[PDB]
Amino acid sequence: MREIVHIQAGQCGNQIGAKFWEVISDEHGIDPTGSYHGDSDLQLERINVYYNEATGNKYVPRAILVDLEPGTMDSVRSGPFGQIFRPDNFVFGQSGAGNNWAKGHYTEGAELVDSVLDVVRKESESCDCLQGFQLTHSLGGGTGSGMGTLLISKIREEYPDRIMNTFSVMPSPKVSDTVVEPYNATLSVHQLVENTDETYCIDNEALYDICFRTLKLTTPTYGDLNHLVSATMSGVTTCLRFPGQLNADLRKLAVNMVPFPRLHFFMPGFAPLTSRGSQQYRALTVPELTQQMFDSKNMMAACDPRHGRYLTVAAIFRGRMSMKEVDEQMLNVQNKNSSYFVEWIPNNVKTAVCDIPPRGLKMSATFIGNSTAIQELFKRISEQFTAMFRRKAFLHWYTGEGMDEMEFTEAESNMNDLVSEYQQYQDATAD
C-alpha cells in the first residue's frame, strides 16, 4: 500500500494542516510551485504516499481542504505553500459554523459533506493502492469537530477496508474561545471511538504548558503551538515517507498499536522541544533523547504517563546516531520503568531509526504511546462537560438544530465508559 488521502477541516485543521505540508515538502525537497529540488534520492522513493506526480516533475499534495466559511480559504493560499494545493480540492462553504458542533454535523456541514465526498472519490481513483485517510482537525470548534466527524462516518461506510487516521487537537481553557468546547469535544469523541482506527491526541493544554513553562514563552500564540504540532506530525509520519528497511504503513501501525478497538487514542511525544528560531538545542545525545521522549514534559497530551501503564509504544529516532546506543538506551528504560508497561503484551515497545533528520535539528526523537494515562485527558474533558451540562447552559444552541437531549447524555456516558476501560486495563494483572 502507498497512497494517503489527506483531509483538513476547520480553521485549526487547515492551520496545522498547512503547517504539515510546508514541513514535509521541505523534508522531501518540494517548493511552493510543486517542483523537486532536493539533493537526495531517498527523498523521492516513497513520495507517492502524500503527493501526486503531475506533468513535468510537479509534485502536488494529495490534500483536500475543508471549511464551512471562506475566511480560512484565502489564508491558506496566502501562506508560503498555498499555491501548491490543487485548486479544485478547496471545498469551502459560505455561512460558518460558529463553534457549534451541531451546525457542522447536521446543518451547514451536511449541505457540504456531499460536495467533499466527490473530491475524495476523485482522489481515490487516481490511487494505485490506497491505504487510508488522514484527518487534521480540532474538537473544540464546529467545523473540524462537527463536519469532520460526519466526514469520517461517510468515508468509513464508503471505504470500509481503509484505515481512518486523525490528528485531533483537544480544547483547553488555557487556549479557549468559548466554554462550549467541552460540548463539541465530547460529541466528537463519541464519533472517534466508533469510526477511527488511530487518533493522535494533540492536547492544546499540553502545547500551552510546554510553551509557557518549558519554552518560557510568557504569552504563547497559535504559531508557537502549531510549531510543536508540525514537529510531532512530521515525526509520526516519518516511517511512512522515508524508506528505511522496516515495513511501515497505517494498518501495521494500527494492528500493533491498538489491542482493543476503542482504545486507539495515542499520546505523542517529541524531543527536543524547541521554539521558533532559538538555536538553543545544540548538544543532545542518545541517553538524552531517550530520557526526554518518555518524560511527561515532552508529551503533546497533558497527561502524566507514570499515572498509568503503557499498552504499546512506538519510538522513532531521526538523525545520524549509534544504532547500538539506541537499543541499549531503549532497553535501559524498559527495565527501570518495568511496571509502566503491561506485561500481558510481550515486547510492546518498538524502536526505529531514520537517517534524514528534521530541519534545524541534527538529531530528534518521536514518541507514540497507547497509555492508560490518556484517561486524564478524557476525565478533564468530562468534568468540564458535566459541569456545563448539569446546568443546561447553552443547550438551546444545539437542540435548536434538531439535536436531542439524549445525544448529550450518551456522549457523556460513552466517554465515561472509555475512561472505565483504561482504568480496567490499568489494574489488570497477569497471574
Binding site: 494492528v255 482493543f260 500481558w344 510481550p346
Partner: protein, 436 residues
C-alpha cells in the same frame, strides 16, 4: 528425475530463498544468468542437481522455485538484483496489499485474491516434472503472509498433491530481530492449521541465528542479510542430499523415515558447526571429533532449548568436506560413551551418517570463513517442546484479555479458532511429555 519445487512465502521466505538459491548456484557452478559450463548435457539432463534445476534448450538452468508475496517490495528486488535473469519471471508472483502482520488477512480476506494464481503457476512447474516428490516451503511464523497464506497454500497443496511430500523451513520469532506484537498469535494459528499438512518442519529460531552472528561472527547488529546467509548455509546442508549423490535422505520421503517417528512431532532440531568469522581466515582446522562435539553444545543450535533436558527420537549427521568415515565412527563412539545423550527406548539408538566429500561453499560477500569440514546434525528431541512453551506462554498472556483479537475477527475469521489453535498446541506439548 525426482524433482523438488521450492516455494517462498513472505518477506522472510523470499529473502531466505534468495540466499539459498544464490548459494545453490555456487555449489553447482551455475552463473547468475543460468549458464553452467561444467556438466555438458545439452538439455534436460539427469544429474542429481536436476531435482532443483530444470534445463532449457539454450543451456540455461532455471531453479524450480516459486516466490510469492502479497506486496511487491521484496520480490521486486529479486526481479532487479543479481539473479534477475535466473528464476522464471512468471514464478515471481506479487500482490499489492500485504497481510499487515495479520494471519486472517493472509489466509482469508487478502490471500484468497491470489491463491488460485499461485496454484496454477505451481501446476506449471509440477507438469515440467517426470517424478515430483514434493515441495520445500520457506516462510516465517510471525508474518501475516508467511503464516496465513502459507497455511492456506499448504491446505490446497494437499488436495492437489495428496501423495506428495511437504517440508517446511519456518522462522521462529525473536524479540531481538524485529517482530510484530501479534506474532505469537500468527505462530500458533499457522502451526495448528499446517500441522496435519506437513511431514517435516525445520524451525529456525531467529534468536539462535542472532546470537551466533554476534558471538561467532563478531557482528554487533546483525542485519537480515547476515542472518539469512547463515541460515542458507544450514538449509544447504539439509538439502545437500537432495541435490547430490548420497546414501542418507536421498529423497523427501526418507526425511520422514529418518527424522519423524510420529507425524505430529515432526520438528527436528538442526545444529551447524563450525561457524567461523571470515576475518579469521588463517584459523586452525578443527578435527572431525571437534566439530561433532560442537553439535551437542547449546550455542550451535538453530532453536534455543536444552537437549540434555529431553530424550532423543532420531539423530542424523550430515558431514561436508574432508571427512573420513572411520573418524566419524570414533567421534560417535566418544559422544555415546562420555556424554549422556538419552534416547527413547522404542527407537534405534544408532546415528545415521551421510558424508558429502565436497568442501563447504561460502558466498563471496558473506561473513563466514572457508572450512575444511562442516557438519549439520538433524535430531528429533523432545527438548524442542520448550520452544513451543515460549510461544504458548506469550499467546496466553495476550489472549487471556483478548488483546488484538478484533483484528483477526474482522477479517473473515471466527474467534473460536483461537481456542482451537491453543488447545492443539497444548496437545502437542502433551505429546512431547508422553514420548519421554
Amino acid at each position: 528425475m525426482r524433482e523438488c519445487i521450492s516455494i517462498h512465502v513472505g518477506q522472510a521466505g523470499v529473502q531466505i530463498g534468495n540466499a539459498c538459491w544464490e548459494l545453490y548456484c555456487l555449489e553447482h557452478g551455475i552463473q547468475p544468468d543460468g549458464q553452467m559450463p561444467s556438466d555438458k548435457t545439452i538439455g534436460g539432463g539427469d544429474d542429481s542437481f536436476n531435482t532443483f534445476f530444470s534445463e532449457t534448450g539454450a543451456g540455461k538452468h532455471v531453479p524450480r522455485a516459486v516466490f510469492v508475496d502479497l506486496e511487491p517490495t521484496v520480490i521486486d528486488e529479486v526481479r532487479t538484483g543479481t539473479y534477475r535473469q535466473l528464476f522464471h519471471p512468471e514464478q515471481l508472483i506479487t500482490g499489492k496489499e500485504d497481510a499487515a502482520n495479520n494471519y486472517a488477512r493472509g489466509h482469508y480476506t487478502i490471500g484468497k485474491e491470489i491463491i488460485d494464481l499461485v496454484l496454477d503457476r505451481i501446476r506449471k512447474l509440477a507438469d515440467q516434472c517426470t517424478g515430483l516428490q514434493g515441495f520445500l516451503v520457506f516462510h516465517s511464523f510471525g508474518g501475516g503472509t508467511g503464516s496465513g497464506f502459507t497455511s492456506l497454500l499448504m491446505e490446497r497443496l494437499s488436495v492437489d498433491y495428496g501423495k506428495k511430500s511437504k517440508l517446511e523451513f519456518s522462522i521462529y520469532p525473536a524479540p531481538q530481530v524485529s517482530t510484530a506484537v501479534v506474532e505469537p498469535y500468527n505462530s500458533i494459528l499457522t502451526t495448528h492449521t499446517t500441522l496435519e499438512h506437513s511431514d517435516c518442519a525445520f524451525m529456525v529460531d531467529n534468536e539462535a541465528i542472532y546470537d551466533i552472528c554476534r558471538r561467532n561472527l563478531d557482528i554487533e547488529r546483525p542485519t537480515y542479510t547476515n542472518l539469512n546467509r547463515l541460515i542458507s548455509q544450514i538449509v544447504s546442508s539439509i538439502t545437500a542430499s537432495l541435490r547430490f549423490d548420497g546414501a542418507l535422505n536421498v529423497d523427501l520421503t526418507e526425511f520422514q523415515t529418518n527424522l519423524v517417528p510420529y507425524p505430529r512431532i515432526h520438528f527436528p532440531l538442526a545444529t551447524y558447526a563450525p561457524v567461523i568469522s571470515a576475518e579469521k581466515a588463517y584459523h586452525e582446522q578443527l578435527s572431525v571429533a571437534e566439530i561433532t562435539n560442537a553439535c551437542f553444545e547449546p550455542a550451535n543450535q538453530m532453536v534455543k532449548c536444552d537437549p540434555r533436558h529431553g530424550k532423543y527420537m532420531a539423530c542424523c549427521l550430515l558431514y561436508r568436506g574432508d571427512v573420513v568415515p572411520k573418524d566419524v565412527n570414533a567421534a560417535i563412539a566418544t559422544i555415546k560413551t562420555k556424554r549422556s545423550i538419552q534416547f527413547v527406548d522404542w527407537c534405534p539408538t544408532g546415528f545415521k551418517v551421510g558424508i558429502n566429500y565436497q568442501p563447504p561453499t561460502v558466498v563471496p560477500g558473506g561473513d563466514l570463513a572457508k572450512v575444511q569440514r562442516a557438519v549439520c546434525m538433524l535430531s528429533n528431541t523432545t527438548a524442542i517442546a520448550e520452544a513451543w512453551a515460549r510461544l504458548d506462554h506469550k499467546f496466553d498472556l495476550m489472549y487471556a484479555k483478548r488483546a488484538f483479537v478484533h483484528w483477526y475477527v474482522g477479517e473473515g475469521m471466527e474467534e473460536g479458532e483461537f481456542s482451537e489453535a491453543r488447545e492443539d498446541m497444548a496437545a502437542l506439548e502433551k505429546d512431547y511429555e508422553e514420548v519421554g
